[PDB]
Design a protein around this nucleic acid. Sequence first.
DNA 1: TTCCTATTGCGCAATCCAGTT
DNA 2: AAACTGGATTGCGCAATAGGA
Lengths: 60, 60
Amino acid sequence: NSNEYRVRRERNNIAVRKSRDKAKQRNVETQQKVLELTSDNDRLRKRVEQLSRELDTLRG
Amino acid sequence: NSNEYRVRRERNNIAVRKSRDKAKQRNVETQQKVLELTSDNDRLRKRVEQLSRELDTLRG
DNA sequence: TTCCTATTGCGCAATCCAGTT
DNA sequence: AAACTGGATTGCGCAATAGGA
């Protein structure tokens, strides 16, 4: 059954390559969402800043 | 020389360990961040909402 | 148990990158 | 400039071992 070794390896080195490739991609995606969230975020910081300037104007 | 080689190996194996851990790292860091981000952004929309009604109402 | 794949840590070699001689 | 260092990164296979029919 050492006659299985190799065949099994390759069967493995391919499963590896796959897993990894997957991972890397899942990061990218995750990585990406960070930028999407940082977009929303500043959007809000500025927005809030705005409303604030507003009541600060209005009231005081 | 030989050990010449085996030591340059030793060296690299470590740079490799280090560098791989720093990446395991960054990869988490990001996870964490994608969280504080989701939370932050979210408590920020609720602040805009809150801050707004305070305006509709402080107007007429 | 029994097979397969999936995932992980690890080492080799080739590069890549800077700061050097 | 042009080869030269020496760590950092990265593609790649190996082996152990987690998982889930």
